[PDB]
Amino acid sequence: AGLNTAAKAKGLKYFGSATDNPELTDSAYVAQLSNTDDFGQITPGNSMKWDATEPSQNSFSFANGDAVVNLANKNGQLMRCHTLVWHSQLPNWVSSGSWTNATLLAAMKNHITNVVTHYKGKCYAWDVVNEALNEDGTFRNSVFYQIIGPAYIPIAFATAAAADPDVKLYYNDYNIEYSGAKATAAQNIVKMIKAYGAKIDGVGLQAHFIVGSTPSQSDLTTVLKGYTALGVEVAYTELDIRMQLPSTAAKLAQQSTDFQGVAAACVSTTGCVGVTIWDWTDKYSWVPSVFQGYGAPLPWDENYVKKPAYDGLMAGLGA
Ligand SMILES: O[C@@H]1[C@@H](O)[C@H](O[C@@H]2CO[C@H](O)[C@H](O)[C@H]2O)OC[C@H]1O
Ligand SMILES: *[C@@H]1O[C@H](CO)[C@@H](O)[C@H](O)[C@H]1NC(C)=O
């Protein structure tokens, strides 16, 4: 019937989509977001981030996050919860603070505990730490890394696990889907967290790819298996495949094969639990604002009509 029914028939837990609160006023959009043939899972694109949930220290704010949860609940969809510790979309109080390790650690742990406790029982997974790596596999020099050092990562995991022992704890990043230093370093994060004694259940592979420059099915699969070998699950968490504009029939067909290999790589790897696309319609993609000259990244176009990539996904899912 659709992406999610096809995914589930192959043993995935879900096919899903991100969304964001301003889109939830668009009835046509919401109708399709709510189509569980296609979407069995939802991620809030912005409303569970630190700026949204803790705009002033110890002052939490859940209305916007909860509104996305409530829509998933209405539909019977799972949630992925995104994201507890990240260098982007931090409120001023974090980014401007005079911190010691002790004071920043207290603030970070209190952020995690409060946000995870709030959502206890509501999330399939949390992206506990997002984008902790540079491209060469060194640690990104965020405020957390500068002040706390590498331990921030396992401390964040352990804090989330204490607050909600049931939810899957993920490390999420981009450019860790293909073989290279960054993916190796992501494997090393998994190892480090466990060496500390902290819980990590999953690796989240953002999968912000480029039409005609997407990792191959074979390399995607080697990489997924390099994480599942470590005793963790994997998921593609933010899949989109941006094209150099203008859109053409040939680019749309390439985009289809590119999507197809992602879905098929997941199916081929036991322990790949699902795929989430980073929204589902080109209208609402984050891409054009960030990647100048790129766009049209998703399986439906800006008028909510299926593109060839929808069929590529279905083919990769063996439907
Ligand atoms: O802020 C980050 C973006 O920098 C990131 O950008 C990457 C850059 O390397 C790539 O070409 C990858 O395809 C892009 O997504 O994407 C995630 C975002 O949060
Ligand atoms: C911060 O403190 C924790 C002990 O609670 C520790 O694991 C870590 O090394 C410290 N980091 C720095 C840079 O002092």
- Alpha-carbon distance of 29 to 21, in angstroms, equals 12
Of the residues 100, 101, 139, which should be mutated to test ligand 2's pocket, given the most ligand atoms within 8 Å of the CB? 101
Give the residue from 272, 250, 251 showing the smallest Cα distance to 316: 272
Q: 269 with 221: CB under 8 angstroms? A: yes
Tell whether ligand 1 has an atom less than 6 A from the beta carbon of residue 254. no
- Catalytic annotation, pick one of 54, 177, 233, 238: 238
Q: 58 with 93: CB under 8 angstroms? A: no
65: left (phi over 0), alpha (psi -120 to 50) or beta: alpha
Q: What domains does the chain contain, in order, with CATH numbers?
A: 1-319 (3.20.20.80)
How far from 73 is each of 6, 76, 143, 247, 282, CA to CA, in Å? 21, 5, 35, 36, 25
| Amino acid making up residue 99 | W
- Alpha-carbon distance of 214 to 313, in angstroms, equals 14
Indicate which technique resolved this structure: X-ray
- Catalytic annotation, pick one of 131, 135, 177, 233: 131
Tell whether ligand 1 has an atom less than 6 A from the beta carbon of residue 174. yes
Q: DSSP letter for 128, please.
A: E
Q: Give burial (CB, 10 Å; 0-12/13-18/19+) of 121.
A: exposed
Tell whether ligand 2 has an atom less than 6 A from the beta carbon of residue 220. no
Give the residue from 168, 166, 169, 165 showing the smallest Cα distance to 153: 169
CB count within 10 Å of CB 14 equals 23
Q: DSSP letter for 293, please.
A: T
Tell whether ligand 2 has an atom less than 6 A from the beta carbon of residue 148. yes
In sequence order, what are the beta bridge partners of 132? none
Cβ-proximal residues to 9 (8 Å cutoff; 6+ apart), any chain: 317, 318, 319
In sequence order, what are the beta bridge partners of 102? none
How far from 240 is each of 18, 35, 50, 294, CA to CA, in Å? 11, 19, 23, 12
How far from 91 is each of 48, 86, 199, CA to CA, in Å? 13, 11, 27
Query: 17 C-alpha to center of ligand 1: Å?
Result: 18
Tokens of 217: 């099915």
Give yes or no: 238 in active site.
Answer: yes
Q: Give burial (CB, 10 Å; 0-12/13-18/19+) of 65.
A: buried
Tokens of 253: 């067909």
Give the residue from 137, 301, 170 showing the smallest Cα distance to 237: 170
- Alpha-carbon distance of 23 to 56, in angstroms, equals 26
Tokens of 244: 């150099």
What does R_g of the chain's alpha carbons equal in angstroms? Answer: 19
Q: 277 with 310: CB under 8 angstroms? A: no
Give the residue from 99, 77, 128 showing the smallest Cα distance to 280: 77
3 state SS of 102: helix
The torsion angles phi and psi of 100, rounded to 5 degrees, stand at: -105, 175
Q: Give burial (CB, 10 Å; 0-12/13-18/19+) of 131.
A: buried
Give the residue from 229, 233, 227 showing the smallest Cα distance to 183: 227
| Inter-helix orientation angle 249-267/308-316, to 10° | 20
Q: 117 with 164: CB under 8 angstroms? A: yes
Tell whether ligand 1 has an atom less than 6 A from the beta carbon of residue 237. no
Locate tokens 């939810």: which residue?
167
Question: For every residue of 145-188, which 3-state class applies, written as one string?
Answer: HHHHCCCHHHHHHHHHHHHCCCCEEEEEECCCCCCCHHHHHHHH
Alpha-carbon torsion (29, 204, 7, 245), positive or negative: positive
Residues in the chain whose C lies over 2.5 Å from the next residue's N (breaks after): none
Give yes or no: 233 in active site.
Answer: no
- Alpha-carbon distance of 153 to 81, in angstroms, equals 17
Query: 151 C-alpha to center of ligand 2: Å?
Result: 6
Query: 47 C-alpha to center of ligand 2: Å?
Result: 30
- Alpha-carbon distance of 197 to 302, in angstroms, equals 46
Query: 148 C-alpha to center of ligand 2: Å?
Result: 5
Tokens of 189: 């994060």
Locate tokens 């899903």: which residue?
16
Q: Give burial (CB, 10 Å; 0-12/13-18/19+) of 298.
A: buried
3 state SS of 280: coil
- Alpha-carbon distance of 15 to 79, in angstroms, equals 11
In sequence order, what are the beta bridge partners of 236? 205, 275
Terminal Cα distance for the chain, rounded: 9
Tokens of 294: 């790129």
Q: 15 with 39: CB under 8 angstroms? A: yes
